[PDB]
């Protein structure tokens, strides 16, 4: 009906705005540092199983 | 008495020229504006 269409028309001309929109750039730092010292000696003797 | 077309969207009248004077009167009356009733908005979401 005309109401309901000049309604319609001015619901439509509302939602029809242009849609912005983004540039998601992340930016994931997985940074990672690792530092072992073994140090360890071993005596034995296999004649005599020490 | 009273008629009217929306094929046109007329009103059509029976009765008097008193009812043709009161009635045109009458016609007249309600032509107005239509007061933008809004019944329906949309709200963009902030």
Known sequence: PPDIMLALQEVITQLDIRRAQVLIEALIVEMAEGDGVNLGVQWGNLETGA | ?46
Request: aromatic share 2%; glycine share 4%; hydrophobic share 35%.
């Open chain 2, 1 to 46: 008495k009273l008629v009217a077309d929306e094929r046109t969207n007329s009103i059509l009248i029976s009765g008097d020229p008193k009812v043709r004077d009161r009635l045109k009167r009458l016609i007249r009356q309600l032509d107005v504006e239509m007061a933008s009733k809004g019944n329906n908005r949309v709200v963009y979401l902030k």
